[PDB]
Ligand binder design. Sequence first.
Ligand SMILES: Nc1nc2c(ncn2[C@@H]2O[C@H](CO)[C@@H](O)[C@H]2OP(=O)(O)O)c(=O)[nH]1
Ligand SMILES: [Ca+2]
Ligand SMILES: [Ca+2]
Length: 104
Amino acid sequence: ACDYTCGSNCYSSSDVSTAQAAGYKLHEDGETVGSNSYPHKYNNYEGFDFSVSSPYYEWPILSSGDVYSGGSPGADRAVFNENNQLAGVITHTGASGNNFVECT
Ligand SMILES: Nc1nc2c(ncn2[C@@H]2O[C@H](CO)[C@@H](O)[C@H]2OP(=O)(O)O)c(=O)[nH]1
Ligand SMILES: [Ca+2]
Ligand SMILES: [Ca+2]
């Protein structure tokens, strides 16, 4: 079973932990990858009810199981905060334009 389902994508907690660890490390070292410069601040325009404190940062999580390194980011994102706490897993899949909806 999936711990997180983003559209047709199935993720386990380990997938998210691995993605988050890579994103958080880049954030701490003040480095970014990809033309869209990940990881970067997530403003929460959507108004999701995150249970952890801000600031929030978004980092791509890939369906292939591979850690994002600069190519096409896809539709799914792991959102973490300054204390390395997972805020949530979101996706553009099933959402209009560049909006996000939460993964179930
Ligand atoms: N939809 C959305 N985009 C955000 C948010 N925070 C930052 N962004 C960025 O604002 C712009 C319009 O959505 C994009 O550059 C998007 O970045 P990403 O495209 O890298 O997610 C947010 O809370 N919601
Ligand atoms: Ca997996
Ligand atoms: Ca692989």
